[model samples]
Target chain A: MNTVRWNIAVSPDVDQSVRMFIAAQGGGRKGDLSRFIEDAVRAYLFERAVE
Target chain B: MNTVRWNIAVSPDVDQSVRMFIAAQGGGRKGDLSRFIEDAVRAYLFERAVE
Candidate 1:
């Protein structure tokens, strides 16, 4: 499936810190930041769908 | 900074789904899921302040 962008304006700390965390957590090599976010959202959303 | 709990009510499914993700993500291993969320919030808030 194709992906769409739903960009948002967040805080600067939010921006820098996430980058740092992503790098530390090993999602920074090939633009996996988006992927990480998707996973987080999915984890929450999936439970609702299972009902 | 001092830590404080800010509890919220969500759907039954949502209530623990995030907890599951948290548990699997290494954060829950040490009661760190809250820590992860704080980081997420910090990043977004930081971006807005930079403007």
Candidate 2:
């Protein structure tokens, strides 16, 4: 139940898409992109088993 | 936009398994767990995408 912070870079193209989705309709987390990621990762791992 | 650090509190059993695997496997990222993760993730995503 802890958290972390990032200081890395990602694909600029990917970033643009992420920004667009967040800025668009209903599912973006309103800028809390980090939270969304952790949840997604946790779900993936929980469902698929740790890698 | 940047790299992040974590303060995750995962299941001890899960942690133990991860630790055990890395301890025994040469495929570990020379102790860079994060690097190992990025490779696995990117590979998975890339394969899933271009497959």
Candidate 3:
């Protein structure tokens, strides 16, 4: 699977919260944050496009 | 307003869908994709963090 880099700017609060949430979930992997953002983006796009 | 850049990688399908969706909605201004992504990320993070 190919990957693309996106320079996305998000709310500082949201960014901080997500980092904390990942830590809470025991984010041991290096790509945890990237994976989380991808999942969130995919889910949101799916919901919007499907509905 | 401070903003941080995230190098997020998403599914090609989702990315394409989002681009099309934005165009369908008439994405006239620049930063539309970035804005949309930020909004989606914020919403998802909020839901997860709050719940």
Candidate 4:
């Protein structure tokens, strides 16, 4: 289903941790951080949807 | 490294979907729904933290 979603800015400290994990996962780059977050969120939502 | 966390109740509908996905994913049992959801949330958060 399609729905309007909102985005929020994370604190610098949180962003740092997120960056570290993303880099460790080898699935994203600094520029793709937001998309990376979106992907994770979608994966989570999708899982929830299937449940 | 230590922080207080909170829990919330999910609607029965949402809970059903979550259970299905967790079972399908082969990572959790119906009785472990809450833990499954927590894992998903933590995974999502961890990915964000690296970004």
Q: Which candidate leads the pack in lDDT?
A: 3
Q: Write the per-residue lDDT of candidate 2 for residues B1-51, one digit (tens) a residue.
A: 555443333334444444455565654455354444444445444554553
Q: What is the lDDT of residue B32 in candidate 1?
A: 44
As for lDDT, the candidate ahead, 1 or 4, is: 1
Q: Which ten residues in a row have the lowest lDDT in candidate 2 chain A?
A: A2-11
Superposed on the true interface residues, model 4 gives a C-alpha RMSD in angstroms of 8.9
Which regions in candidate 1 have their CA more than 4 angstroms from the true location? A48-51, B1-51
lDDT of 1 by residue, A1-51 (tens): 335443334334444565676555575377455554545555645764575
Between candidates 1 and 3, the lDDT winner = 3
Candidate 1: tens digits of C-alpha lDDT, residues B1-51 = 334434332334433555666556555365344454555566554664475
Error of 2 at A41 (Å): 0.6
Give residue B6's error in model 2 in angstroms.
13
lDDT of candidate 4?
Answer: 0.50
Clashes of each: 13, 8, 0, 14
- Residue lDDT tens for model 3, A1-51: 877666677667767877777787786767767787677666666677766
lDDT of 4 by residue, B1-51 (tens): 432233333334454555466566785455454344345545666655575
Best by DockQ: 3
Over A13-46, each residue of candidate 2 has an lDDT whose tens digit, in order, gives 4444444554554563543655444444455446
**lDDT (0-100) at residue B31 of candidate 2?**
39
